Amino acid sequence: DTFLEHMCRLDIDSPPITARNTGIICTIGPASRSVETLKEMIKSGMNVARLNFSHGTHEYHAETIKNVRTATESFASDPILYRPVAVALDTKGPEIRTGLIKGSGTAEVELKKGATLKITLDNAYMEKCDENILWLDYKNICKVVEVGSKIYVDDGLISLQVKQKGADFLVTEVENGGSLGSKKGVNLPGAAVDLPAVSEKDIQDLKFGVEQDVDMVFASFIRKASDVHEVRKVLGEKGKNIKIISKIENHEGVRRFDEILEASDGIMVARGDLGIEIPAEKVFLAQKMMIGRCNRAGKPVISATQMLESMIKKPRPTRAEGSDVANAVLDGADCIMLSGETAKGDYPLEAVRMQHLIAREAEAAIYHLQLFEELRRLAPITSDPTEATAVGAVEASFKCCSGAIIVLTKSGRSAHQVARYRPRAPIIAVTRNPQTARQAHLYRGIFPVLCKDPVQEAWAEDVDLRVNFAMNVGKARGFFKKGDVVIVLTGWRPGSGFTNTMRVVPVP
Amino acid sequence: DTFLEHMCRLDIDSPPITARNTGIICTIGPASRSVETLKEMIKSGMNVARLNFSHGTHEYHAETIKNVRTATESFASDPILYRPVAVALDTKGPEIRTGLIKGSGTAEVELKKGATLKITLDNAYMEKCDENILWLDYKNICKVVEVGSKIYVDDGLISLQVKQKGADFLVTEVENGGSLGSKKGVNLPGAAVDLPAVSEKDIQDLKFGVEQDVDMVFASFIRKASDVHEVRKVLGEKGKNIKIISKIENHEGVRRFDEILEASDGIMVARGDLGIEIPAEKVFLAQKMMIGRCNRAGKPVISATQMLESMIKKPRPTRAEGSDVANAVLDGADCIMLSGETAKGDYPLEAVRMQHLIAREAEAAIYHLQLFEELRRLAPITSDPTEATAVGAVEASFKCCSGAIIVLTKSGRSAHQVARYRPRAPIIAVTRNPQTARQAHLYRGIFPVLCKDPVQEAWAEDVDLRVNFAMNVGKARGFFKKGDVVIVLTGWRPGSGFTNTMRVVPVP
Amino acid sequence: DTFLEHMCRLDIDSPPITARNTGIICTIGPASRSVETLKEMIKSGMNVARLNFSHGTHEYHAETIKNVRTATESFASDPILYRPVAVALDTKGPEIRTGLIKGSGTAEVELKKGATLKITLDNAYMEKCDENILWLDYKNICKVVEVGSKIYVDDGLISLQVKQKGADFLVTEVENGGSLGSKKGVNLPGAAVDLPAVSEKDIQDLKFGVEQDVDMVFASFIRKASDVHEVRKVLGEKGKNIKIISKIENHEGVRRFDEILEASDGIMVARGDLGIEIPAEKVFLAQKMMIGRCNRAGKPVISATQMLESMIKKPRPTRAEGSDVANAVLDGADCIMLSGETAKGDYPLEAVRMQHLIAREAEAAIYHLQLFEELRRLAPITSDPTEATAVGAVEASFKCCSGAIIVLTKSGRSAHQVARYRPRAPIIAVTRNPQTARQAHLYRGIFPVLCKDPVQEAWAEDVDLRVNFAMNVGKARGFFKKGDVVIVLTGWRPGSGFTNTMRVVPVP
Amino acid sequence: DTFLEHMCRLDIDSPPITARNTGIICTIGPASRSVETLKEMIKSGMNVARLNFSHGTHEYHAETIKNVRTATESFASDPILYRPVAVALDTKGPEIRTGLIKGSGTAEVELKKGATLKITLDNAYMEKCDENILWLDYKNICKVVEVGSKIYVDDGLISLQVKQKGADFLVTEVENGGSLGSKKGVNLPGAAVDLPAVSEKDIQDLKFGVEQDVDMVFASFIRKASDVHEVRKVLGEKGKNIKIISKIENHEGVRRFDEILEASDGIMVARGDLGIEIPAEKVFLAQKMMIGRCNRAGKPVISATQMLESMIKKPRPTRAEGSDVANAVLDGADCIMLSGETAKGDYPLEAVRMQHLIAREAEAAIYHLQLFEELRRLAPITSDPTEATAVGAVEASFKCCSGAIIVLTKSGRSAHQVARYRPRAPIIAVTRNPQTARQAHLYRGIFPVLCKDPVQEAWAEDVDLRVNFAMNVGKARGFFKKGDVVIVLTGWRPGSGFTNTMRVVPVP
């Protein structure tokens, strides 16, 4: 009825009645590139393998994608239970990274409050940083910094405000402290950055991605719409179909968020990079704002970083990491991302699993019909057949309590359009295009299904075969039973430009 | 918006930007049964022809039907512009009536105020009525009426008050003077009048109605469900498919309205008969209530019995009758009924043309999305395929700003199912079944269209036959043009089931 | 709940539970200037005596106002039951009137379809018009007419389209026909008018009004906001407090309706003058539009002309005059007006009474809380103490089912502001300013009460005395009983610029 | 609007344009009971001081109260800027606790995974606990626990699994390693733990609470209404006026929540205790439900037990705790509670200051008129004077865009009555009664203000005393300025009755 009536009526001992609508992106690192580790991850809800090109070589990310695909297709033998799994390339982007401190890639020299540390960029101490003296990537720091500007190191625990500029060197106080350590990153919040959004390394990484048939790019440190356009002209014609997800990692990208969203296929909210750049008492508005617009606009949005970073080293998360994530789902994020817990973890399965749990359970508190009616209200009058067919399909899904909204697409477009409006019922997307099954996982509520059957002489016949596919899938995965109802969205005629037929059909 | 704003921004100087949705019912009498006259009337907007069986032999009304079918079909050589026309039989009923005035001649005597009238029941004075003895044929008048009771003779114009009750007579003072002719009808407001709702005449008349394939019965002085049931049993299973419209003409009907509606296919508010048997000020609440229940019940209701009464003898009406019909059409009426204006009148055509104009001009003060959003969440929720397909279709018509909702069933039932959500787009109902094209004028917003084609021996090709028909009609008739989007509703097959294919098709 | 649920729930045999909120303006003429006739009219709900300065002298309207006041104060002895009665001056305004036809002020010469009639304005036939030849007021008709323009005579039944222009004379066909008769009016729909909105006669009439302490002016044929401003500069400083009601009697005033409403204190909709000037299939939108804006803006609006014009000569109105009026109340008119039925009538009491009945009964179909919530929603953020106090007072009146909203004002302003928002509960306005008690009757829902008690030394005491007045008034008139609730709106402190105190106080 | 738009148009870069409405509760321990420290905390936002009676003698907490009263009143020489401060007693309850570790010293032993622990009940080992024998003081541990049961020692950090049940002991495998000190508390999730809700200690502690005029009791491990009733009977009629907040810390409480709420003055969600006894993913639904019921019930609810847990030993928090408190305040919390951060922490002040900042920044994602329009038509409708005066006052605050709603009762009850409609303007509650100024921090949006003046011997002058006080406070404290409009609520007199004078006063 009311939103409040709907929170009051929640029952913690009622069962999970929904299957899980929000997607899980896992970051694949040393702890999760074994094929066996990944088979389990896929079995515990992984849907997108993130590769962080901020660290490592090409032969290594290619081994990593080979094991992801080895595990993903161990399931292929029975295409009903087969879960697609997408590969995501997260670019490096305009980073600043520290040296090796002693000559060693595993050291940490422990800075002390009040102490003094000279930044050098003498290209000499590239691997000699100790307690004083410190080397950096950014050649032109001595230009955008000023005598008081604050510099954060590692994800941010080690802080320090400069006292002495230079032209070659720089010297500074230490508010905070801790460990320095090696190959760490540096932030310069509230300080300009003349690094390009696409370095020549990031160009090479993108093109690699095209060669490897990745399904999405996570473009780092996007600040303005030219940065998106560059990523796409690199991906070029060969990767006009790769989805670009801009990462909002600084204040500008929030300020310039609308034009970033125009140019991009979806948005990643990097909550930690933000909670360094802008005061933290405000990230959570930014997130909420940036999710809502991505929902007005029916573009995926990914909530990321500092999710369960206590499952790097405990097998069970703080009850407030739990609440953090479960509220990202409620704000209407499309997907959730794990960085350290699945990459460097001592318990990566435990994290993937807990994430599926938390997120299944947050949908108990989604008021699905308020969402829908708000998102319909806010939709424009279109002359798009496929848009109107989606809206009707969702109305109907609510007046039946549809078990599903079976949607046949090659594009993926038409299953996206239906999910735009947040049906409570799951969208079973039936495709023959393995790229579209992998990319579908971005969009909340799409359960992609990959048909491998050959195309039939008579298209009528063909449609029935795909739809019956989807219905054995639903019966099996548990979404419904004989004699329930579904919406089915198809074309009338082959090579109809659009998905313009809705049938309200009882499960057989 | 508000409703109040939707008025504030009305524009008289603007041109009607909606079709006429309300059906025009016409009472056929001697001024309007020539074939040429009925052809010109059908041209001007007539949708239903009412025969009034209180007057006339079966051989008379059989010829009047003959000419209406003649006229109606003169246009049948161009399906695009053939307009179907329904044939309604209105019953005599439990009427009280006067005897005859004596002599021969201009059969009329003057009833002067404050003077005296013995109502007698002696069948000697049956043909010897005058200003002192007046015979009527209700034999228990004397027991159901009392002293001080009113008696309205000739259709309300004359009032008597009952001064003295006798054994088998009554002495009355004339209170509303007038002039009395022969066989004119009497109203005993407030009396327990006990005549059967179905007389032996009414039985032979309904059995006539079936022999002539009439489409609706307007049944008179209905008081209770048992009355509707007796009419139905009489129509029996040779005429099960005839629509029965109960006429509410007295207080017990308004009282028992609810049970009368459940038992009936539709309602007629008879405001003149009801203006006699009720405090005339209370009438306009009676109608507002009974239109209201009828709309929530999804049952057509007709607003009647005096609409444009000046035009018996004047070509144009007093704007108060125009505000009267306009507010009946806004109140919720599906049909308006013309009675004297088109039966015995001098301008049966300027009457049809004016009513068409007033209904088409009133529809602008109808706030249409208001009506939808409520009727979506008033009328039975959460059910079965057909009602989910219909709602799906209406939310689509609203999203894509459809120019028409093209509906294929043969009963009519699924086109009703849609009209019961008051979409803003006209519902073109395509049927091969002439009765349902005639009968569907009762439902507001439905535009019957009769496909006279043989059936293509393949379901989808038959469907596109009909849809392409509806399209060409709608383009000819002005509803939509090339490039607009229409919604389409159909069978899953000819397996029966129900109607469960919605489609959003651009207009060729 | 819904609007439709609220129409369905109407009961015609439940009692009138409301007292009558809409006001009644009666036109005082030969049949109603006796003091005894008027005492009864006041006793049957008259609230404003309209004097039509279109006919008659000054000594005559002054006799007429003397008898209105004689009857109004026969009730004054017991100020609880005393009903105030306001005098309204309806100007003549830029009229065109015909001659005397034979030399006699009572003749009628009966024009015939197709016939020929010369208009002359030779100032010679001022009183000789017969069947041919016809004299007019308007000197410059031969300028704004053209060879085909249509001229209507009497309220409009006699029509005629010119065939021959001139410089001095004019000659014409006769569509329609009937009686010509004497001192009749002429309309020139769709034809310019160089008559002034304020003739020198209308100046004199206004100033007379000021001398006689009229309470409102009904300004005729207002076309633009300069016309309002002229009426007020005439009324001048001595009549800055006389309320000006513009009459919208032609197409322009509808076109220029907004600026007319700015300049004026309220609007009269003259439905007959309109239904000649603009097609009649559109008056009823104009009316509806013009009432709604007058409600958005909290200015009184009066629905007028052709109300019950069958109670000029029958003691009981057409059931469709009844429906006409009862729908004006529903559209939200503030007041209702009778012209012929109370002026020239053979049954003026019967009309005043039926009007009270019809209008009491229409409020059964007002959804009072939808009104309020729409009118609140549509209100601006004001920093007006008195506006906010009114809105809260009305909310409260709904959360109690207030018997009344007792409002103490001198101005009248604060009782107007409360009524702006259409409480269901009646507004008892307690004033010492007899002008404000008389003018209050314009505003729907104000039941003015005139306190004659002297001002008390202590203002606290004084307020209690006026409020207890109002509560004996309510107890007596029937609005409520001991132990019910009311809202009471007063000032805190004397000579507070405003009514800023709301008390929710139980009737004693 | 939509709710979704209200997010889409959030602006991080904008400055907080609302006051803090949520009360900050602080747990006073050894890091925060000096008088100087409490003065600085009260300055930074503390509204309530919580004593935790699980630890400490009566002479200890009596001195801690002494200093809180000292600090609190240092500011009392300027009413304008004295902030009242409530004193909350939190009970020990049915706690299970460990014995002591042997020796003396740094009383801590290491519990290593996969190793063994005999839980014994022999009061010989009561002070001779170690890594093998661990004594606890719950004597029926053995019958309510089972094999495979978990046992969480020291506040969740340590988990044991029950390998072997004995007669009077248990053998357990250590699953979450750790370090164990003395007298640390045990959780037996899922066990029928039968200790009394009110122990003999808790009785002497509540009787202390009354001797010291505390204002609220936070009562722990409440499971059923009878538990609340036993606490109430103990507080007896010397402390009838003390507010009892039930603490929901186990599953039976969440289960029986509804009865617990009826019996209680308010709720505390204890998310850490609740995160142990429940699947931690289910917690965030539990809270959302229990905040929800509490808001519809118009009963304050506190969100607690881990809010900013980093700041025990770090000056600023992990943004995830910040998103955590922000979403508790949006969920509906009236108060936030700080526990370790301000009791034993190193930065008790940077914690108060940060929480103030996070609550004040979160209130922008609160959609306020949404909350009103529902709470107006959810919460008991159509009644009695006081609730009609309160709603009147809120609709006014919204119309005139009020800067404050200034409320005079002495109990507090009428200021609650208003806060229960969530107005957008802060409620300045003016009382002469210090307890109600302290106690009213529990209610969101209420800003207590204590008038220390004697009573003017004339009701209205007393009223203007207080109102002019509230005005000057509100101007000093920033809420509104000269020329803004405030709403005022008051007695009709000191006759009792209730509160029934609303007033809309401009600001001097």
Which chain B residue is nearest to residue C16, measuring alpha carbons? B282
C240: helix, strand or coil: coil
User: Is residue B338 within 8 Å of B295, Cβ to Cβ?
Assistant: no
List C270's β-bridge partners, or say none: C304
Give the residue range(s) of CATH 3.20.20.60 domains in chain A: 22-93+197-362
Within the 450-479 window of chain C, which residues sit less than 8 Å (CB to CB) from chain D?
460
Is A99 marked as binding a ligand? Answer: no
Q: Which of B288, B323, B374 shows the shortest C-beta gap to C284?
A: B323
Q: Are the C-beta atoms of residues A293 and A257 closer than 8 Å to each other? A: yes
Tell if the CB–CB gap between A4 and D296 is shorter than 8 Å.
Answer: yes
Give dist(CA A266, CA A262) in Å, integer.
9
Residue ranges of chain B assigned to CATH 2.40.33.10: 96-187
CB spacing of C400 vs D393 below 8 angstroms? no
In angstroms, the CA A233 to CA A202 distance is 13
SS3 D93: coil
CB B44 within 8 A of CB B352: yes
The Cβ of residue D43 has, within 10 Å, a number of other Cβ atoms equal to 15
Of B289, B316, B318, the CB nearest to C8: B289
Question: For chain D, what's the residue count?
Answer: 508
Cβ density class B116-146: b for 16+ within 10 Å, e for less = ebbbbbeeebeeebeeebbbbbbeebbeebe
Instruction: Compute the nearest-CA separation of B274 from chain C (Å).
Output: 10
Q: How far apart are CA A449 and CA D337, in angstroms?
A: 47
Q: Measure the CA–CA gap between B86 and B440, rounded to whole angstroms.
A: 9
Best A376, A377, A383, A399 residue to mutate vs chain B (most B CBs within 10 Å): A399
Contacts of A413 (CB under 8 A, 6+ apart): A386
Tell whether residue C178 is among the known ligand binding residues: no
Q: Do C271 and B306 lie within an 8 Å CB cutoff? A: no
To the nearest whole angstrom, how far is the Cα of B341 from the nearest Cα of chain A? Answer: 44
Is residue B369 less than 8 Å (CB to CB) from chain C? Answer: no
Binary contact (C374, B288; C-beta < 8 A) = no
Q: Which of C72, C98, C305, C342 is catalytic?
A: C305
Query: Which runs of E-coded beta strand occur in A250-403?
Result: 266-270, 301-304, 335-338
Specify the 3-state DSSP secondary structure of D46. Answer: strand
Q: Give the minimum alpha-carbon distance from C381 to chain D in angstroms, rounded to a whole number.
A: 5
Strand D427-431 with D405-408, pairing: parallel
Q: Which of C130, C105, C107 is CA-nearest to residue C120?
A: C130
Q: What are phi and psi of A207, to 5 degrees?
A: -65, -40
Token pair for C504: 């929710």
CB proximity list for B15: less than 8 A, separation 6 or greater: none
Q: How far is CA C393 from the centre of its chain?
A: 27
**Left, alpha or beta for B427 (phi > 0: left; psi -120 to 50: alpha)?**
beta
Give me the phi and psi of C118, to 5 degrees please. -95, 130
Among A448, A418, A419, CA closest to A436: A448
Q: Specify the domain boundaries for CATH 3.20.20.60 within chain D.
A: 20-93+197-362
* Site from C158, C323, C352 to mutate, B interface, most B CB atoms within 10 angstroms: C323
List the single residue in D4, D9, D322 with the smallest CB-CB distance to A280.
D322
Quote the distance between the C-alpha of residue C310 and its chain's center.
20
> Among this protein's residues, is C305 annotated catalytic?
yes
* Ordered alpha helix ranges (H), D26-57: 35-44
Chain C touched by D385 (CB under 8 Å): yes
- Rounded CA gap, C420 and C445, in Å? 9
CB C231 within 8 A of CB C198: yes
For testing contact with chain D, the best of A252, A258, A281, A374 (most D CBs within 10 A): A281
CB contact under 8 A, A291 and D255: no
d(CA C302, CA B167): 54
Give CATH 2.40.33.10 domain extents, chain C.
Answer: 96-194
Q: Residues with Cβ < 8 Å from B498, sequence gap 6 or more?
A: B385, B386, B414, B491, B492
The H or E element spanning position B43 is helix B35-44
Q: Is A17 on the interface with D (CB under 8 A)?
A: no
Q: How many CB atoms lie within 10 A of CB C380?
A: 7
Distance set, CA C298 to CA C222, C266, C320 (Å) = 20, 9, 29
Put simply, whether A400 touches B (Cβ < 8 Å) is yes
Q: Which of C297, D419, C306 is nearest to B324 (CA)?
A: C306
Of residues C331, C305, C351, C335, the one with CA closest to residue C245: C335
The whole-angstrom separation of Cα A204 and Cα D445 is: 56
Q: Do chains B and C touch (3 or more CB pairs under 8 A)?
A: yes
User: Where exactly does CATH 3.20.20.60 map onto chain C?
Assistant: 22-93+196-362
Q: Point out the residues of A that are catalytic.
A: 50, 97, 247, 305
Task: Tokens for A212, please give them.
Answer: 């490897």
CB contact under 8 A, C296 and B4: yes
DSSP C440: G
First to last CA, chain D: 34
**Closest residue, chain D, to C506 (C-alpha):** D385
* CA pair distance A272, A88, nearest whole angstrom: 20
Chosen from C368, C378, C400, C405 to mutate, greatest number of chain D CBs within 10 A: C400
Q: Residue D294: left (phi > 0), alpha (psi -120 to 50), or beta? A: alpha
> Which residues face A267 on adjacent strands?
A246, A301
Question: Are the CB atoms for D206 and D225 separated by under 8 Å?
Answer: no
Regarding chains D and A, contact by 3 or more CB pairs under 8 A is answered as: yes
For helices C348-362 and B280-296, give the axis angle rounded to 10 degrees.
Answer: 20
Helix (H) or strand (E) holding C387: helix C385-400
Nearest CA in chain A to B384: A400
Q: How far is CA D342 from the centre of its chain?
A: 14
Angle A296-A302-A303 from CA coordinates, rounded to 5°:
110
Chain A contact present for D374, CB below 8 A: yes
Q: B440, B446 in Cβ contact below 8 A?
A: yes
Topology adopted by domain A96-194: M1 Pyruvate Kinase; Domain 3 (2.40.33)
CA distances from A304 to A139, A272, A301, A378 (A): 30, 8, 10, 27
D437 alpha carbon, distance to own chain's centre: 16
C-alpha distances out from residue C215 to C72, C261, C445, D23, D63, Å = 14, 19, 18, 58, 76
Q: Which ranges in chain B are annotated with CATH 3.40.1380.20?
A: 368-506
With beta carbons less than 8 A apart as the criterion, state whether B250 and B187 touch.
Answer: no
Give the E-state strand segments of D58-184 in sequence order.
86-90, 96-97, 109-111, 116-120, 133-135, 150-153, 158-165, 169-176, 178-180
Contact predicate C407/C380, CB 8 Å: no
CB atoms under 10 Å from CB of C225, counted, come to 17
Q: Minimal CA–CA distance to A198: which of A171, A170, A232? A: A232
Distance of CA C480 to the CA centre of its chain: 29
Structure tokens at B232: 């139905």
Dihedral sign for Cα atoms in the order C24, C25, C30, C35: positive
Instruction: Using CB atoms, pick whichever of A376, A400, A501 lies closest to residue B388.
Output: A400
* CB pair distance less than 8 Å for A289 and D8: yes
A222 within 8 A of A228, measured Cβ to Cβ: yes
Quote the tokens at residue A56: 């490592």
Bridge partners of B129, per DSSP, are B101
Residue A58 CA to residue A24 CA, distance in Å, equals: 24
Catalytic residue numbers of B? 50, 97, 247, 305
Query: Rounded to whole angstroms, how far apart are CA atoms C120 and C118?
Result: 6
Tokens representing residue C17 in the block: 């539970």
CATH topology of domain C22-93+196-362: TIM Barrel (3.20.20)
Q: Given the structure tokens 């044991």, which residue do they identify?
A: D160
Compute the nearest-CA separation of A305 from chain D (Å): 10
Q: Residue A317: its chain D contacts at CB < 8 A?
A: 280
Tell if the CB–CB gap between B501 and A500 is shorter than 8 Å: no
Query: Which one of 3.20.20.60, 3.40.50.2300, 1.10.3720.10, 1.10.10.1100 gives the CATH number of domain B20-93+198-362?
Result: 3.20.20.60
Phi-psi category of A495—alpha, beta or left, where left has phi over 0 and alpha has psi -120 to 50? left
Q: How far apart are CA C421 and CA C489, in angstroms?
A: 15
Helix and strand numbers (H, E) in chain A are 18, 17
User: HSE on the CB side for D308, CA within 13 Å?
Assistant: 37
CATH fold label, A22-93+197-362 = TIM Barrel (3.20.20)
Token representation of residue D45: 């936002």
3-state secondary structure at position A484: coil
Q: In terms of DSSP bridges, do strands B499-506 and A501-506 run parallel, antiparallel, or are they unpaired?
A: antiparallel
User: Rounded to whole angstroms, how far apart are CA atoms B312 and B152?
Assistant: 22
Domain D96-187 is classified in which CATH homologous superfamily?
A: PK beta-barrel domain-like (2.40.33.10)
Q: Decide: residue C419, CB within 10 A, 0-12 exposed, 13-18 middle, 19+ buried.
A: buried
N-to-C CA span, chain C = 33
Q: Is D165 helix (H, G, I), strand (E, B) or coil?
A: strand
* Cα Dmax for chain C: 78
The CATH code for residues C368-506 is 3.40.1380.20
D20-93+197-362 CATH choice from 3.40.109.10, 3.40.50.720, 3.20.20.60, 3.40.50.2300: 3.20.20.60
Q: Over B154-168, what HEC string results? A: CCCCEEEEEEEECCC
According to the annotation, is C90 in a ligand binding site?
A: yes
Q: Which of D384, D388, D485 sits opposite C388 (nearest CB)?
A: D485
Distance CA D100, CA D77 (A): 48
Compute CA distances B320 → A139, A446, B358, C63, C281, whole Å: 87, 59, 12, 34, 10
CB neighbours of residue C461 within 10 Å = 10
Contact B390, B418 (CB under 8 A): yes
CA distance D387 to D378: 13
Q: In angstroms, rounded to a whole number, what is the distance separating the alpha carbons of residues A371 and A421?
A: 8
What order do you get walking across the sheet with D116-120 strand by strand?
A: D96-97, D185-187, D150-153, D158-165, D169-176, D116-120, D133-135
Q: In what order do the strands lie in the sheet with C150-153?
A: C117-119, C170-172, C158-164, C150-153
Measured distance CA(C322)–CA(B141) in Å, rounded:
30
For D249-310, strand residue ranges (E) read 266-269, 301-303
Residues for chain A: how many in total? 508
What strand order describes the sheet that includes B158-165?
Answer: B96-97, B185-187, B150-153, B158-165, B169-176, B116-120, B133-135
The pair phi, psi for residue A196, each rounded to 5°, is -80, 150
Q: Which residues of C touch B291 (CB under 8 A)?
A: 7
